[PDB]
Amino acid sequence: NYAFLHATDLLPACDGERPTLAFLQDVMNILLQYVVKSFDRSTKVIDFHYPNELLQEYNWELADQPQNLEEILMHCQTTLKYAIKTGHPRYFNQLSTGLDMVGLAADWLTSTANTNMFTYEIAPVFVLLEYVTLKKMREIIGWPGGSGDGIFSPGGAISNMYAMMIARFKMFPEVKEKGMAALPRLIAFTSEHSHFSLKKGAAALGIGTDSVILIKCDERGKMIPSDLERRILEAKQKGFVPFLVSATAGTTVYGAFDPLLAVADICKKYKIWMHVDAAWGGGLLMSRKHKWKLSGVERANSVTWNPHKMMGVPLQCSALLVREEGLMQNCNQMHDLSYDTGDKALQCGRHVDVFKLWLMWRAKGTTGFEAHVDKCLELAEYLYNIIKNREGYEMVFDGKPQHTNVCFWYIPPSLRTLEERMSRLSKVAPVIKARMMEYGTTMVSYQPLGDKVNFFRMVISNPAATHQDIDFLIEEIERLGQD
Amino acid sequence: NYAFLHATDLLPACDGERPTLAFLQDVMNILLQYVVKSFDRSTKVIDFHYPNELLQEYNWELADQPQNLEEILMHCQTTLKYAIKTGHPRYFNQLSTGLDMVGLAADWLTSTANTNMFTYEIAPVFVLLEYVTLKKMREIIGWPGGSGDGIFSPGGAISNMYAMMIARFKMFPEVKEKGMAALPRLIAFTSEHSHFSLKKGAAALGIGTDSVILIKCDERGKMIPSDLERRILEAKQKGFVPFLVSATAGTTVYGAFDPLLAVADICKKYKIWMHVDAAWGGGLLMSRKHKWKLSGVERANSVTWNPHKMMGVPLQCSALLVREEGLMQNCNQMHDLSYDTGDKALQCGRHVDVFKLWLMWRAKGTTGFEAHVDKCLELAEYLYNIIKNREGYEMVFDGKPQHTNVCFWYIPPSLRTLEERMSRLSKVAPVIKARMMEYGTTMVSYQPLGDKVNFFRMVISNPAATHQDIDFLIEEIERLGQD
């Protein structure tokens, strides 16, 4: 078979149908095996290699002449061998964790359809799903009858960038033709705990990171409303022009939620666009129990929401929602057609990301997403309640998690009663993490923040993570902490 | 089975392995069937429905309660039913056409791995493939030993946007902190035949579409070098600052190639960044026979290249290549680590697109891509030679295609000897196109350009398209043109 086959033998080659059905099914068998193992707790989360080791371990170089299909199937096998098992019960390293089965099936179909999003003409079903999916999301947000507008973007960082583009265009439509030189000095405001995409977006948009002012946060990670007003008032005293405040509904580290009702009030007072970065926190909008954390989002001019994070949609499902209909097109256009849409965004070519969200929503219902969001949040509560009362574990800030983010230090037995042992604590998480990966038992991110030294930022979003996996984690950290 | 199953029954559920293997395989069977039919010439390219018809034809709405897996498999079946068959031999509607079997297999695996690109830590193999794939592309471009830098972007439109960001940052690194208000008035230059992403990028970057000057093109679609110099000289006479010239290597309509050696010389003379938009034309760099069309690309500061177009990589494979190493990081950063990479681009989250290109390159070799690029170009020559000498067919410009783009009018027998029958010709392509879709036999794009009225822009990039399919097309157009 495959040893005497090549790509040129497969469809659209005439003697191609039989070898194609076999080859694709053999890839599928590899994929299925990896899928089941991903859920097996005896499987390593990571088979860790240094870049040079991985380079020397296998030939990854490219060649002039073609390789046979046996060698291609081996490449697939080898690739999944060294891949991180992002669906594994004990993978806790990023905000996006898990491997959703309907979502995967939906992604497989999307690739098979392999079309662009720009017109109804070539993506008729997908343009319609995009309209229905984004409308429902606008209802969940709280905009009356789901009114407003929306787009899927290639990342919430770009969704944030779009929101800033549109807030500027709204205040100064002439920027499009004339550039920033035509405008007064624009100022944007965001929290000290907010995502770096806002500074990056401003730099990209010719606004300048100097014109992105950071607002002070409290001990719990929440933007202080009175520092925001103070800063707005300073800006317009200097004759600068506030155009944007970006509030974060679920920060990346603490999982903190800015007080939306108070910033909404400040944005009402000063006539400023309110954006909500709900990339991470947006999932809690599916929870009747937890959505109160996003109270005031209904007053926002724009919202960013990443179903690829808490809702488990396979990678790249990010939406921007804008309340004022027509704005996005006006901003982005350069010159039944209502289904294009092409001149609403910066992208030209655009990958179909809607179907994976829509099929999952269909398979799970709104209630399904709800139940999952709550399962994760309780599990974080289970973690928080154990370590809160456990010797060797000190919380990074006082206040219960908002959110599945649990931030903590592990203090090894050889450091607890030491009479600036912070310097030694600073080095504990990096060593544990290193040992986690060498053994491949779990993965957790650690980082410093402000005046805090390297601490573990535990996060839960994987449906495969259970109470035992939290129990295992606590114990593994202890085991690996010597010293 | 599936009638009494739900998503909650599948992995990671404990009684989940058996129903998961069955469900995923049943989706796969649907996908395989659609794949084989895509190559069957008796299959319709499109089952055309108006948006309202499609909405009424099937319930696409979302619900609170979950649906069973039988209903989910039907959704998959229904979705592929109304999908355009972008792999079909007679699909000619866009620049991206075809369904590559290794590429599809590679895409299926990528989804299964479901990881982010931002660090070696979670995408160890994929970060390494990205380094090797982009280096080879830099060699093919002509940069010595493949020196330089590169990134995959979510579309060549964003790659174009990145190039403009970086050309600006290179001339005025202070823009990052201070914004466009700190700078002199920047001017960018591009051809009348160039892609709209350059104006869109400038508007986004706060540069202003007023500061994107369009350079005159000749009858064959190529930028006139002396209008470029004329325009550059006017800009600096007014004390404006030329920062960018974007030359197009393969325009979207004519498939024209700007004269790179002459613009390179102008960019050398005036000390201006040279970008090459080779999104479409980049494939010809794989052809020893055809690469001379891109002579001078080796002198470019940046190049955009979309393997998802002519090379047949499934949707979203776009690269930006930059000759000066370190520039991209310096531009994008806000503050063995060499494998991150995260602060090189605007995106945070980033989808893995490298593996589909790398596996295909492995399966085909450089020679494979070469042979395919030539197969398409000859087929376009076959089209051009038939219609050039065929009654009823008038070429849109004089000069042989550059390129698989063939631009033409069909003049129905009831218009040929008419003594301003252009007004009636203006309406022929829209009617034919409409009839093409109602019958579902083929799809071709038509458009006006400048002083030319609606003409067909035929394009070839699909490996499944043969001589018979061109023959069919000629005849179908004739059949449908009455009147």
Curated annotation (Swiss-Prot), chains A, B:
Record's bilayer topology term: Lipid-anchor; Peripheral membrane protein
Listed GO biological process terms: chemical synaptic transmission; gamma-aminobutyrate shunt; gamma-aminobutyric acid biosynthetic process
UniProt feature coiled coil, ranges: none
Cell location: Cytoplasm, Cytosol; Cytoplasmic vesicle; Presynaptic cell membrane; Golgi apparatus membrane
GO cellular component: axon; clathrin-sculpted gamma-aminobutyric acid transport vesicle membrane; cytoplasm; cytosol; Golgi membrane; plasma membrane; presynaptic membrane
Enzymatic reactions: L-glutamate + H(+) = 4-aminobutanoate + CO2
Keyword Transmembrane: no
Residue positions where N6-(pyridoxal phosphate)lysine is found in the record: K309
Enzyme class: lyase
EC annotation from Swiss-Prot or TrEMBL: 4.1.1.15
Keywords: Cell membrane, Cell projection, Cytoplasm, Cytoplasmic vesicle, Decarboxylase, Golgi apparatus, Lipoprotein, Lyase, Membrane, Neurotransmitter biosynthesis, Palmitate, Phosphoprotein, Pyridoxal phosphate, Synapse
Cofactor dependency: pyridoxal 5'-phosphate
GO MF annotations, alphabetized: glutamate decarboxylase activity; pyridoxal phosphate binding
Reported modifications of this chain: Phosphorylated; which does not affect kinetic parameters or subcellular location. Palmitoylated; which is required for presynaptic clustering.
Ribonucleoprotein found in the keyword field: no
Residues annotated for substrate binding in this entry: Q94, L95, S96, R457
Family: Belongs to the group II decarboxylase family.
Oligomeric form and interacting partners: Homodimer.
Record function comment: Catalyzes the production of GABA.
Official protein name in the record: Glutamate decarboxylase 2
Residue window of the full protein shown: 88 to 584 of 585
